[PDB]
Symmetry: C3
Subunit: 402 residues, 3 copies
């Protein structure tokens, strides 16, 4: 149950909400309509609960991948920017906010992995994955290593696996074909074979996780790491002279990191859809609009062309957008759960030598089908639970009857 003649916005606490409120303050002075910017605890799980009944905020800010599930449940309204406003943002971002052909959210910020190198240890970072083994031997003489990054989570190893033509799901016609999985094709096989080759030649360690990767780079033990903008602040605190650049190529093809997009979606239950559109399109998604948010807490790379060109003077931001443009957009579909499950197991089992690359990737298809079944069962029994609570008490109850 939301209000009217006013706007209420939900954005996460680690974002520039104070700056966003100042955009809402600018909105009030022009239209006379009050904007409240709330940052409630765990709004990502709160929003599906409250919007189902017709409540919650007018606008919600979150990563696009979670919006797929909101649109599935009919919680988000179809946004209607004209052709001219769509040319204002980078074309690829709009694909991240599409569900069932319809547009469901406005892209705000773009997030992806880049290659972070130590400038003092390595002044000219490698442009290819293939020249890293040769670089490791040269650094091992100085008591250092070439590259250390998280190998436990498929999110970090995917950029290399996807390089030569591996994909999560095929995206064409504006939809993801769930019968077209690209986990054990020729390109993903070569990608992961290179990773396993790096481990059995002792150029990397299969035990390396996020904490070990970060700690190593910030202490100056390793020349390179692979990480997102979320980690820049901690590297700043270590006093390490670092640079952020384009990811290394593999077989001449660029690394394809997953692209995450911070998006603004309109609650389908909102009586202020016309107002939200006016706010987002003409007050927020403008140079002056994003600037207020960015000065509170940096947005990183942004969807708006005109303002991205301005931030891109920071070479670390330019590198985020470059790797993003060369990358795969994170699929917003529910099948993505089964994907992480299968690929996490596949990478772990290949890297440990417990399974061949070929057999580990082949097992992913059967392992993801297994997860599907478990979720299918979860949904089935949750439904039966609700059904019983629906009929026993809602209708006939001991002390009334059907």
């Amino acid at each position: 149950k939301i209000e009217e003649g006013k706007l209420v916005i939900w954005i996460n606490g680690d974002k520039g909400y104070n700056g966003l409120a100042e955009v809402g303050k600018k909105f009030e002075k022009d239209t006379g309509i009050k904007v409240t910017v709330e940052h409630p605890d765990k709004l990502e799980e709160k929003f599906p609960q409250v919007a189902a009944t017709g409540d919650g905020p007018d606008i919600i800010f979150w990563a696009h991948d979670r919006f797929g599930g909101y649109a599935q449940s009919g919680l988000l309204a179809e946004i209607t920017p004209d052709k001219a406003f769509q040319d204002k943002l980078y074309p690829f971002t709009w694909d991240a906010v599409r569900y069932n052909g319809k547009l469901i959210a406005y892209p705000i910020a773009v997030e992806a992995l880049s290659l972070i190198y130590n400038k003092d240890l390595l002044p000219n970072p490698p442009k290819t994955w293939e020249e890293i083994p040769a670089l490791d031997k040269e650094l091992k003489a100085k008591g250092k290593s070439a590259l250390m990054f998280n190998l436990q989570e498929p999110y970090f190893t995917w950029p290399l696996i996807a390089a030569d033509g591996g994909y999560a799901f095929k995206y064409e016609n504006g939809k993801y074909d769930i019968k077209d999985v690209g986990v054990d094709n020729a390109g993903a096989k070569a990608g992961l074979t290179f990773l396993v080759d790096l481990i059995k030649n002792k150029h990397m360690n299969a035990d390396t996780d996020y904490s070990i990767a970060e700690a190593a780079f910030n202490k100056g033990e390793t020349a390179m790491t692979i990480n997102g903008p979320w980690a820049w602040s901690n590297i700043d605190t270590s006093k390490v002279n670092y640079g952020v650049t384009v990811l290394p190529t593999f077989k001449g093809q660029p690394s394809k990191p997953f692209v995450g997009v911070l998006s603004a979606g309109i609650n389908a239950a909102s009586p202020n859809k016309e107002l939200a559109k006016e706010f987002l399109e003409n007050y927020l998604l403008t140079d002056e609009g994003l600037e207020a948010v960015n000065k509170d807490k940096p947005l990183g790379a942004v969807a708006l062309k005109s303002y991205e060109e301005e931030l891109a003077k920071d070479p670390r931001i330019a590198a985020t957008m470059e790797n993003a443009q060369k990358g795969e957009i994170m699929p917003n579909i529910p099948q993505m759960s089964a994907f992480w499950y299968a690929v996490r197991t596949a990478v772990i089992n290949a890297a440990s030598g417990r399974q061949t690359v070929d057999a580990a990737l082949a097992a992913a298809q059967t392992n993801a089908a297994a997860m599907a079944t478990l979720e299918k069962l979860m949904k089935a029994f949750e439904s039966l639970k609700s059904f019983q609570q629906q009929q026993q008490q809602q209708h006939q109850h001991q002390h009334q009857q059907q």
Copy 2:
């Protein structure tokens, strides 16, 4: 159990079985073949048990929706009426007796929802749904209400939901496409939004069932109700001056009620397949044949054109047919179990405001899949039991085993 040279017929106890026996009596005098008409308890439940082993009646009379289950199991014979006989019944009725492309039964009677109105309170019934909110306000001044009908079943509320373009399944080329579902489209959405708008504007009550509606109309508390031919006899006893007319139109589109068709199938195991065709086509499905049945217990609207024009002199029977021709035929496929489960919950949660119309219809897909899963689980274990049964017991065992 059966023979060659005689016919045995199953028809439900609440039908005109004596009148059917009269048609069998006329059949015996012209061809010299004795026809028995039986009406056993739970014959709809018994038929699949005895027909599977090769027994049961030569002909079974039941609603067409249950015939899909019989044809799936191969208990029904493919009927062969020529083009000339197919023009004798209403074209749309043949679609009810079609499973897997082939015709499997003869259409006898047609049954559908109609608008029943109190003539004393409302001489000119509304032609549109849009004018019922305003019509309720006038009647509330006299302590009465405009419309009260069952909202607990989706069968009664579907007419409105399907009006603007909602559909259960797409029907083309004589086949249902189970991938093409229309519960979550703009048409179904608008229809259900109007139903919910009526309840929150206090024109209708969210908890109105079949009992509460029938008793209110028959006492003269409400001006209109929605119900089928099965309920007329109860209104007759109440002395209420009532009429039966076409359902109100929504957005200029007609309400589309589901159409049940009383049908006569021929057993697959029947050695009298030719005799059953002669009896059903040239003796029962004539003006004389249906008359004898109709005078024992009213058939409602009939499939045969010639005899329907005769019955349509009764304004109630003409309206049952009119609503049936404007509505969609009840699908006989097994995916219909899950459809009802999902839609029942979708409507209830929309009516009670636990879920917004958009969100309530979105969850339908999820609940239809849930019922498919735990339905598939039932067949899984049923099969496994039958297996270990014949395998372990019927076969290898202590005495002359293995």
Copy 3:
């Protein structure tokens, strides 16, 4: 691991492994590369276990139907014979060693069911199924029966069932269409009906299994039996004058038995793929190669055209190939488990009179579905316990923690 510059082969103990070693000995003499031929217990179970981790033989010999699973798990390398070599083997055998459109093994020997007749009791065997009822009545006057074979397993009864148009799954364009199942069609109906009618007319007994069938023919109580080459040795010992000929035709159409093709597959983890191709194509798949193996233990009908013509001078081998050439290759897909489960029960129930032919075959569709859901249930929980195991190795316990 298997080493390099050496070749190691796995073949079942009941095949001519010594003769294969002779070919290995010849390979060693021309090229200087030693070939070991191991015959481990239960290899068909061991191979998936060891080849997954990268160990196992360089070459494995097994029936093609098990290879589809090995290819699914990516344990088999794609073989590369040129057009000129593929003409050397019977075109239909290449369809047995195909998975995902890729060739994954070399065809060695063909195995299929044949009609075996007693010469002393029946000098001229029936060419058609239709005359067998009449032929049984002539033999019951002499205290004998016309035909006795295993009716408990669908493998044996299928030839008759498939003849008029029955099929497991449609094999077109190289792939198997799972949605197109030919168990419930008119052809399979008629086949099973004839079988059921044979039992109903006391020409065969529904309780007749493999052991009863073989013992009766080997004692000389029955004129005909249906069985493969695997049983010839037992008939030889009984001193019975027997012949092996083409299966009887049903409705002028040939009986379609399932074809088993013994095959040589190269391990995907083999560092000797080039050497295995040299060995198999130029040393084994030649007149002298197969002869060496055949003299140790008869291969039956072979895949190689040249050596097959030479073997066809044996009337029994010519028939095995003839019946195989008119029959169908047994699908190498996982869905075959559920097919056997369904059809086995279908035929059992039709033979016993528990269900009509129509009702029995109709239930096979739902029974096959039930087994599939059972199977993907087994797989789901197997991957869940693997996940729980994998978690620990990564995980926290009283030896260490995250």
